[PDB]
Amino acid sequence: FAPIPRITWEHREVHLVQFHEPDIYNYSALLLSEDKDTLYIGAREAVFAVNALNISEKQHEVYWKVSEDKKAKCAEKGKSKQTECLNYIRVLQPLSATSLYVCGTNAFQPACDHLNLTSFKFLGKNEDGKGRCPFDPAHSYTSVMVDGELYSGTSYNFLGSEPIISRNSSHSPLRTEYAIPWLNEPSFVFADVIRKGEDDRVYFFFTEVSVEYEFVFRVLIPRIARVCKGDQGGLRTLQKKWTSFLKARLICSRPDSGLVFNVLRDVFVLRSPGLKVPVFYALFTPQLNNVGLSAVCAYNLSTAEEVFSHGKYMQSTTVEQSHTKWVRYNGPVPKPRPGACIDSEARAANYTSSLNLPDKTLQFVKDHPLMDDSVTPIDNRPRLIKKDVNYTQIVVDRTQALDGTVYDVMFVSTDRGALHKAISLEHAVHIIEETQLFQDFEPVQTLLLSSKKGNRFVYAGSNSGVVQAPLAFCGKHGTCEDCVLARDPYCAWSPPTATCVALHQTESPSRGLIQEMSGDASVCPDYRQHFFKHGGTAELKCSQKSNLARVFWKFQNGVLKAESPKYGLMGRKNLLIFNLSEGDSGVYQCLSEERVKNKTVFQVVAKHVLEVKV
Amino acid sequence: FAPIPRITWEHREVHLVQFHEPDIYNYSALLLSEDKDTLYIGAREAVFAVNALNISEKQHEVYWKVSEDKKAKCAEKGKSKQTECLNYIRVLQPLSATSLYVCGTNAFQPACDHLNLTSFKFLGKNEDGKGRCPFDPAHSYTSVMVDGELYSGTSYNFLGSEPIISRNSSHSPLRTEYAIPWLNEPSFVFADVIRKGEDDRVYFFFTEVSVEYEFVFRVLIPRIARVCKGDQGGLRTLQKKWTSFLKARLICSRPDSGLVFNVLRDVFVLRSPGLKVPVFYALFTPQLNNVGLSAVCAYNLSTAEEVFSHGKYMQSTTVEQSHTKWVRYNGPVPKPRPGACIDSEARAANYTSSLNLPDKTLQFVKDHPLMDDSVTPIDNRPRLIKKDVNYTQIVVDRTQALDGTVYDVMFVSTDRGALHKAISLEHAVHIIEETQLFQDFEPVQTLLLSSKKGNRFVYAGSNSGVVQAPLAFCGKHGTCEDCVLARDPYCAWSPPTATCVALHQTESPSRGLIQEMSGDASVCPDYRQHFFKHGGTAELKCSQKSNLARVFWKFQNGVLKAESPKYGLMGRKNLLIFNLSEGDSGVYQCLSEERVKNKTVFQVVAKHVLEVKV
Ligand SMILES: *[C@@H]1O[C@H](CO)[C@@H](O[C@@H]2O[C@H](CO)[C@@H](O[C@@H]3O[C@H](CO)[C@@H](O)[C@H](O)[C@@H]3O)[C@H](O)[C@H]2NC(C)=O)[C@H](O)[C@H]1NC(C)=O
Ligand SMILES: *[C@@H]1O[C@H](CO)[C@@H](O[C@@H]2O[C@H](CO)[C@@H](O[C@@H]3O[C@H](CO)[C@@H](O)[C@H](O)[C@@H]3O)[C@H](O)[C@H]2NC(C)=O)[C@H](O)[C@H]1NC(C)=O
Ligand SMILES: *[C@@H]1O[C@H](CO)[C@@H](O[C@@H]2O[C@H](CO)[C@@H](O[C@@H]3O[C@H](CO)[C@@H](O)[C@H](O)[C@@H]3O)[C@H](O)[C@H]2NC(C)=O)[C@H](O)[C@H]1NC(C)=O
Ligand SMILES: *[C@@H]1O[C@H](CO)[C@@H](O[C@@H]2O[C@H](CO)[C@@H](O[C@@H]3O[C@H](CO)[C@@H](O)[C@H](O)[C@@H]3O)[C@H](O)[C@H]2NC(C)=O)[C@H](O)[C@H]1NC(C)=O
Ligand SMILES: *[C@@H]1O[C@H](CO)[C@@H](O[C@@H]2O[C@H](CO)[C@@H](O)[C@H](O)[C@H]2NC(C)=O)[C@H](O)[C@H]1NC(C)=O
Ligand SMILES: *[C@@H]1O[C@H](CO)[C@@H](O[C@@H]2O[C@H](CO)[C@@H](O)[C@H](O)[C@H]2NC(C)=O)[C@H](O)[C@H]1NC(C)=O
Ligand SMILES: *[C@@H]1O[C@H](CO)[C@@H](O[C@@H]2O[C@H](CO)[C@@H](O)[C@H](O)[C@H]2NC(C)=O)[C@H](O)[C@H]1NC(C)=O
Ligand SMILES: *[C@@H]1O[C@H](CO)[C@@H](O[C@@H]2O[C@H](CO)[C@@H](O)[C@H](O)[C@H]2NC(C)=O)[C@H](O)[C@H]1NC(C)=O
Ligand SMILES: *[C@@H]1O[C@H](CO)[C@@H](O[C@@H]2O[C@H](CO)[C@@H](O)[C@H](O)[C@H]2NC(C)=O)[C@H](O)[C@H]1NC(C)=O
Ligand SMILES: *[C@@H]1O[C@H](CO)[C@@H](O[C@@H]2O[C@H](CO)[C@@H](O)[C@H](O)[C@H]2NC(C)=O)[C@H](O)[C@H]1NC(C)=O
Ligand SMILES: *[C@@H]1O[C@H](CO)[C@@H](O)[C@H](O)[C@H]1NC(C)=O
Ligand SMILES: *[C@@H]1O[C@H](CO)[C@@H](O)[C@H](O)[C@H]1NC(C)=O
The missing domain is CATH 3.30.1680.10 (ligand-binding face of the semaphorins, domain 2)
Structure with a gap:
């Protein structure tokens, strides 16, 4: 397990810029501009534009509040009129240089619109966001804008009984099947496009009820999935449906310790300036006996690509004769490969789109969306496992040290408004520092990194406001x-x-x-000099920042023992001399000791010159 | 989750009698006499008889040390000559009024013998304890002497690759099958006879690798099993094998919280003076993500009896066509019922013993030892769930309060030498107190209760010695x-x-x-009176025992705030007046506040009369 954060910064002792609008809550959507100088905030019933360099500088504001007849309609449907019956912004995506694509829950009438950036006024497009945006502010949701087309993972309905991974295309709309093999009670976490004959892919990450596993209760399992950008659906079957939807287990565990983290919380794509292959940094917690534990697993894209491209699929079978069990399929796989993109190979066999794929291949993928092989982490183990902490969102910055040794810096937020900075040092986690981002211990719902020259910041949203922090202090x-x-x-x-x-x-x-x-x-x-009265009592203040160091006192070149009656320790760091007399005068030294490798590092924290009067 | 232990008793502040023999370790076996006045201790290479009323009074001693040629034989087999190559007493059971049945690992040559109680000398019976006693001091083991016949659950070999539940009968020896359906990597926890036409049964409790469940790693599952005392094996099939061996899941979980405890640690049989049916108090920990958690589930015998007598069995099936999966068997069950005892019904159909059962019934039980129904706890939930504690052994005393309301008192030992006393109050756990039994934080390996008139004690064994505690202080x-x-x-x-x-x-x-x-x-x-010098500093000592109460100070009838410069709190309970002057004189009161139900209970802890001199 990872140690405790080396240094703890109180909200008081660091420069953190804060933003919130009075009577506006749930600052869950964060999006920064092309120029990186303007951060847009999507809150409950409002959208703002703030100076990303000083989030406190409010530049623009726009509201999208719900009418009383719409609130009462929602309440009449047994929902909470002043809680759930409001417009929670769920989709805050770039559309153009002059506009953003915005969707809100809207008292359970998911509505989409275009925010005109030049005016900071909504265009009144009033699109039905059913499938694009959740109805309930409680429901999971994910979206990625790819080539001006929204790829979204959320619920297709009010109750959240119908899940959906779909593309609002207008030219070629595509959605998943409403079937257990495809999606089985998912909770959407993250989505992004992985760009390049070879087609681009749109990856999806979520937790859903497992079909391959059976236990005392229903077992959840993290999932990595992908679809092909160029998908157009099937012609005869899979009409208006994904032909490229394949999924697999995302495994985060240390088995020699019985630790399994089967609930995915966040996913970050490390886009390496140097490394040609992106690395997914995924954040997980366990479904069972979470008390709480958090783990950070890093997955090499190539690994996942290997499973989707060459892995054996899973078959569903009837078992005695009312049950369904899932096993490795070792039978004949069709060609072109089910779930594959329209690549160089397909084009040679005169296949231009999904619309011209054989029904054999299309039927296969429809009945086999799940892969037998698991997608495993780099070095087959988590990068960090922590106890007594519930981690909420993650960001990673690949930074070059003085030495030139590259470190992947993990910024991990907690459910109590804190941010931890960790690096995997030589085969051990080092949590550099922890900072209390929210004075109200509000859980960090969203986290967003800008590692760009000049504007190097981390932006964290919670229900109470947004915080702006540098990457170091x-x-x-x-x-x-x-x-x-x-x-x-x-x-x-x-x-x-x-x-x-x-x-x-x-x-x-x-x-x-x-x-x-x-x-x-x-x-x-x-040397802090003191002059106290005879018989009196002295408090010699001493403090340091390492949560991994302990302080001891020294008087007259010897390690003083803070025991009654002459001595006492107030707050484990402040020395208390009780009955001052001639002999108590002189130099008092507060020293710290911290282990780094094998060695101990002693430092002189405080120097005091105490003089007792007559 | 259960609260923190209300009061903590240091080994220093309570009367605890201790016992250990210099250079003798691993005090793992405890057995008290008929008269309850003599407790016998089974240690590594020794057996003692101590006065159960004052364990420190050593009455008798007997050793069974291993020879150097036997130690070197063991070491040559790559085992540790000074650790594992010694005689660990594993079987310490009553044989008669004048003898005990003793078995030890004996440098991996399990050996049994009779301890002559009148002499406290071994009889040199030198029996081969292979099957009765484990070879390795690391291996699980359980034994119950029933009608002068040893019923044992342990490994049948050196490596611990062959498990065994068997009866060393001499007349009718019986053992389990060496098959996954019967036992699948078990770790034995507890065994006892449940006494009454109707035959007696010998219950067994253990953790083994599950066949019904499939997950990321192999899943363990607690098991309740039973055999019939009158078993004689099958005639044509099950020759020298159990015909009455049936097992079932022992389920301890709170699902609304995703808490599953699938590793059984201890089992106690509450033999009610009032209640006609015994209650098994079982102690569990989770296999996955244990950090650690402990739960106490109480199971009504009738429930388990209902599963074994009327429950549907599980079938094993071939699945595509190299895999095995386990499902509920809904097919025709033979008569007489497979796994049942020779009862009133069987005797009517001219069946006197297992030896005359139809081959149809015997074959069924051999191929269906596992039941489809789980054995669930009373009120379908654990009696206690605790975090930040690894519980090791359990005992329960059914006690009548002044009111007459009966409480089942749970004494639970920890892996750090501590004992917790808990009762399930009105729909909530109350941990009355905790006591540090071992000054060396040695895990309590074994625990044994004597609730008998006069000699009311709990006896705990660890690797360092044995402790004797009363049931209350x-x-x-x-x-x-x-x-x-x-x-x-x-x-x-x-x-x-x-x-x-x-x-x-x-x-x-x-x-x-x-x-x-x-x-x-x-x-x-x-009123503790004090007289301090002017300008001086005062420490007004105040302490109480409730870990669930907080103390505040009062001066001149008002709630004093222990803040710099005039005041300070040393150790969160001791008041510090810094600069004494005319006005600081008078009455200082230390008060405690603890919530019981809704209400707060204020108590005056310390009363002080401070007088400052001129
Ligand atoms: C992520 O997974 C990819 C998939 O393999 C990793 O890429 C490959 O890593 C191998 C391992 O060495 C490379 O092979 C050889 O590298 C040595 C080192 O200099 C070289 O001397 C050999 O001639 C050969 O090139 C392979 O070329 C490389 N391929 C690519 C496209 O990167 C990648 O390293 C993994 N990244 C992480 C962080 O795990
Ligand atoms: C959006 O942000 C607001 C700002 O905090 C969140 O408000 C909080 O809502 C919770 C309930 O969901 C309140 O908790 C209480 O729960 C008990 C349990 O029944 C109930 O009896 C109380 O009446 C109350 O609802 C919490 O006090 C409230 N915070 C404040 C300051 O009022 C809101 O939940 C966030 N919405 C989403 C979707 O995140
Ligand atoms: C353990 O399980 C046994 C199995 O049932 C429980 O025993 C039975 O409990 C029922 C529940 O009431 C008894 O039925 C009736 O009790 C009422 C109460 O006075 C009485 O008025 C009715 O005429 C009827 O007797 C049933 O008789 C009783 N049987 C036995 C053998 O005990 C037992 O209570 C359970 N113990 C625990 C701690 O759960
Ligand atoms: C029987 O009781 C004795 C009394 O404590 C137990 O002794 C302890 O044995 C453990 C090893 O099993 C010792 O730990 C150390 O482990 C490291 C890990 O490799 C090893 O390098 C050390 O040389 C050492 O073996 C522990 O220090 C030792 N305690 C004392 C005071 O020596 C013994 O394990 C118990 N046996 C059973 C079966 O419970
Ligand atoms: C986006 O907002 C800008 C801001 O006003 C709109 O700009 C006006 O556009 C009209 C022509 O349509 C011009 O005649 C005005 O002079 C513009 N005013 C300003 C301040 O630029 C723009 O039209 C909006 N775009 C859409 C689609 O409505
Ligand atoms: C979501 O789907 C709708 C359905 O068509 C898209 O709407 C069209 O949008 C284009 C401009 O992009 C208009 O020219 C068409 O007239 C619209 N038709 C209809 C029926 O609305 C919408 O653009 C899609 N949105 C996104 C972000 O992909
Ligand atoms: C970690 O998060 C878990 C929830 O995932 C917290 O557990 C809850 O804690 C509250 C506080 O009293 C309880 O009322 C809930 O019943 C708990 N739920 C479960 C499932 O345990 C846990 O306390 C958090 N711990 C840390 C260190 O963050
Ligand atoms: C058990 O130990 C007692 C203790 O000595 C043995 O008792 C002796 O028995 C012999 C006859 O076999 C008598 O002649 C002696 O006088 C007895 N001595 C005492 C002190 O009682 C007894 O025999 C032992 N039992 C077994 C089976 O060896
Ligand atoms: C364990 O099994 C052995 C095997 O027979 C039992 O040994 C017999 O014990 C009786 C006395 O109880 C002697 O009269 C026989 O001569 C012994 N025969 C052999 C071959 O040893 C032994 O008693 C059994 N032990 C227990 C506790 O059940
Ligand atoms: C509870 O018991 C578990 C083991 O079951 C303890 O966990 C081990 O703690 C040691 C101490 O550093 C580690 O070296 C081991 O690697 C841990 N093992 C596992 C599986 O976690 C745990 O610390 C105990 N906690 C309490 C409160 O008793
Ligand atoms: C921007 O940050 C500076 C730094 O203190 C502050 O003085 C200034 O007022 C901030 N701007 C706004 C609009 O808050
Ligand atoms: C029995 O306990 C008493 C109580 O202090 C003690 O004085 C006595 O010495 C003990 N007996 C032995 C043999 O230790």
Whole structure:
């Protein structure tokens, strides 16, 4: 299990910019512009444009509030008039340079519209968002705009009994089948297009009730799925339906410890400036006995692609003679491959679209959407497993250290408004710091990263507002030792400026900078006076930031024992000399000790010169 | 989830009698005599007889140490010469008035013998305990002596690859089949005879790899099983094999919370003086994501009896065409019923023993040992679910309160040498107290209850020694309020003696005693002076035992705020007045507040009269 966050930053001790509109709640949708300087917020009954560099600067505002006759219609359907019967923005996507595509629950009448960016006024397109947007603010939902066409995963109805992964195309509308083999009680988590003869694919991530597994209760299972951008459906069968829909198990577990995380919470696509293949960073929690635990598994796209392209499918079979069981299909697979895209191979066999695929192949995919092979993580284990924390959303920044060693920086939000910064150091997790983003411990519902030159920020939304944080707080570190010991690839010590700087931001010289991810503060170069009355009591204040260090006191060059009657420890860090007399005068030193590898790192926290009067 | 233990007793603050022999370890077997005054301890390479009333009084001792040629033989087989290659006592059972039946691992040569009680010397019977006793001190094991015949569940071999539930009878030896349907990687937990035409039954409890369930990893499942005392095996088939072996799922879970506890740790049989039917109190932990959690489920014997007597069996089937799946069997069941005992019905159809049962019935049971129905707990939920605690063994005492309301008192041991006392109050768990039995936090391996008049004790064994504790510490409670607030059915307040007494032990008058399980201390009838120097500092000590209460201070009839500079709180309970002056003199009161139901209970903990000198 991952250790405790090395340093805890109170909302008070760091520079965090906040945004909220009075009487406006549920800041669940976040979208930043092309230029990255304008962040758009989708809340309950409102859409805003804020300066992404200072979220507190409100630029534009637009509302989409529900009428009383629509609220009462919703309430008459036994829903909560002042809770669920309101317009929760669920779809906030780029449409053009001059517009956004917006959908809201709208007292259970999913409605879509175009937000005119030049005016920040809605165009009144008033489209029926049934299938595109959920009815209930409680229902799961995911959407990705690909080539001005919305690819959405949510419920097709009011009750949330009909799930749907569909494309609102207008030219070629396509949707999933309303069948258990296709989708079995899913809870949508994330979707994105993975761009390139070879066609683009639109991946979907969700948790659904498993068909392959049987246990005491119904077992959930994380799913990775994909569809082909060029899909047009089948001609005779799969009319207006996906022909390219294949899914597989997403497995996040440490078995030598019986830890299985079968509930997917978030998915982030690490788009490597260097690496040609994207890495999905997926966030999971266990369905069973969650108390709570969180795990972060990283999946190489190539792995998943290997399953969808060459993996054996699963067959459903009748078993004695009213039951259905699912097993590996070892029978003959049709050609062209069921679920495959219109690639170079297909085009050679005179196949231009799904509309001209053989009925043999189309029937196969319709009856075999599920793959036998699981999609496994890189190094076949989670990147991080944490206890006593319920992680909510994830973002990852691939950063180059001073050394040139590349670290994948994990920003993980909690259900209590906190953000953890973690890196997988040499075969062990290091949680650099934790920051309390929300003073009200509101769970971070959404998280969004901008790693772009200048505007390097993380944006977190909750029901109470939005928070803007940098990727590091290098300046909070006082000494070179403190700067190095942090083991943050973002932070380096600058001897000329006598400040711990943010490497890859500051205008300090690279060649003349200090950073050691080993934590060996050895690479570094290197008195509060008091006058108290006789008989009186002294409180010598001492504090440090490491949650992984312990402090001890020293008087007259010896390790002082804070025991009654002469001594006491107030708050485990502040020394208390009780009965002051001639001999108590002199130097009192507060020291810290923290283990890095095998070695211990002692640091002098406080220096005190106590003088007792006569 | 169950709250935290109301009061924590340090090993220091309670009267606990301890026993251990220098250089003797692993005190895993405990057996008390008929008279209940002599407790026999089975350790590694030794057996002792101690006064059960004062375990520290060693009465008798006997050793059974392994020879160097036997240790070296064991070590040559790649085992640990100074760890596993020693005689761990595994079987410590009553044989007669003048003898005990003892088996030890014996450097992987399971050996049995008779301990002559009149001499406390072994008889040298030197029986081969293969099947009766495990080879490895790591292997699971269970045994019950029924009518001078040992019924044992353990491994049949060195590697622990062959499991076995068998009867060392001499007249009619019987054992299980070495087949997955019968036993699939079991870990034995407990066994006992459930006594009465109707035959007696010998129940077995264990955890084994499930055949009915399929998940990411192999799923374990707790099992309740039984065999008939009168079994003699089959004549043509099941030659020297159990014909009465039936098993079923033992289910301990809260599903509205996704909590499943599929690993059985201990089983206790509540033999009710009043209730005609015994209740099994079973202790479970989860296989998946245990961090750790413990649950206590109580099962009514009648329920289990209903499954074994009328439940539909499970069939194994071939599925496409190399796999095996298990489903409910809805086909024709033979008569006499497979797995049933030789009852009144069978005897009418001229069946005297298993040896004369039709081959039809015998073949059925051999191919269908597993039942389709699960054995569920009373009120279909656990009696207790606890987090942050790994419970090891359980005992239950059915006790009558002053009111006459019967409480089933749960004594639960932990893997850190602690004992919790819990009762299921009105639809909520109340953990009365917790006691640190082992100063070395050694896990309690075995637990044994003597609820008998006079000698009312709990005996706990660990690798470091044995501990003797009473069932209550009524005397530790100071006031009537404190006595009542404890909500311990064992404790009552005595106004004449001004002491909190143990109801059903003391010679105090029943009619003139105070006890309220509601916790309403309203039924009850109803100054440390200091003189400190001017300018000096005062520490006003205040403490109480409730882990569920918080203390606040009062000065000059007002709730004082322990904030800098004038005030401070040392250890969250001790008040610190910093700069003494004329006005600081007077009465300082430490008060406690604890919620019972809705209401708060304020109590005056400490009274102080502080006088500041001039
Ligand atoms: C994600 O999965 C892809 C799929 O294989 C990984 O890519 C491949 O990794 C292998 C492993 O070495 C490469 O093979 C060879 O690399 C050595 C190293 O220099 C080279 O000397 C050999 O001549 C050969 O090229 C393979 O080329 C490479 N292919 C691609 C397209 O990347 C990828 O590394 C995985 N990424 C992660 C983070 O797991
Ligand atoms: C949108 O944001 C608002 C802002 O907090 C969320 O409001 C909160 O709603 C919950 C109920 O869903 C309130 O909890 C209470 O639950 C008990 C249980 O029955 C009920 O008896 C109480 O009357 C109350 O509803 C919570 O107090 C409330 N917060 C505030 C400040 O009023 C809202 O739930 C969010 N909606 C979504 C879809 O996230
Ligand atoms: C354990 O399971 C047994 C199996 O049923 C339970 O025993 C039975 O409980 C029923 C429930 O009432 C008894 O039926 C009736 O009880 C009422 C109460 O006075 C009486 O007025 C009716 O005339 C009738 O007797 C049934 O007789 C009883 N049978 C036996 C053998 O006990 C038992 O109570 C369960 N114990 C626990 C702790 O769950
Ligand atoms: C019987 O009781 C003794 C008394 O404590 C138990 O002794 C303990 O045995 C464990 C190993 O099983 C020792 O732990 C260590 O494990 C590491 C891991 O490789 C190893 O490198 C060390 O050399 C050592 O073996 C533990 O220190 C030891 N306790 C003492 C005081 O020596 C014994 O395990 C118990 N046997 C059974 C079957 O319960
Ligand atoms: C989007 O909003 C802009 C903002 O007004 C609209 O711009 C006006 O467009 C009309 C022609 O249609 C011009 O005559 C006005 O002078 C424009 N005003 C401004 C301030 O630019 C634009 O038309 C809107 N687009 C749509 C589709 O409604
Ligand atoms: C969602 O589907 C509707 C259904 O057609 C699309 O609506 C058409 O939109 C185009 C402009 O993009 C208009 O020219 C057509 O006249 C519209 N027809 C109808 C019937 O509405 C809509 O554009 C789709 N939206 C997205 C984001 O894909
Ligand atoms: C982690 O999240 C779980 C829920 O997923 C929390 O468990 C709930 O805690 C509340 C608080 O009293 C209880 O009322 C609920 O009944 C609990 N539900 C379940 C399923 O346990 C858990 O407390 C959280 N823990 C941490 C460390 O974040
Ligand atoms: C059990 O131990 C007792 C203790 O000695 C044995 O008792 C002796 O028995 C012999 C006859 O066999 C008598 O002559 C001795 O006088 C007895 N001595 C005592 C002290 O009682 C007894 O024999 C042992 N039982 C077995 C089976 O060996
Ligand atoms: C375990 O099985 C052995 C096998 O027979 C039993 O041994 C017999 O024990 C009786 C006395 O109980 C002797 O009279 C016989 O001569 C013994 N025969 C053999 C071959 O040993 C043994 O008693 C059984 N033990 C238990 C506790 O049931
Ligand atoms: C409860 O028991 C579990 C084991 O069943 C403990 O978990 C182990 O804790 C040690 C301590 O560092 C680790 O080294 C092991 O790797 C852990 N194993 C597993 C499977 O988690 C757990 O810490 C115990 N917790 C409590 C509160 O008793
Ligand atoms: C932008 O941030 C600065 C930094 O303190 C602040 O002074 C300024 O008022 C902010 N702008 C707005 C509109 O809040
Ligand atoms: C029995 O317990 C008493 C109580 O203190 C003790 O004094 C006595 O020595 C114990 N007996 C033995 C043999 O330890």
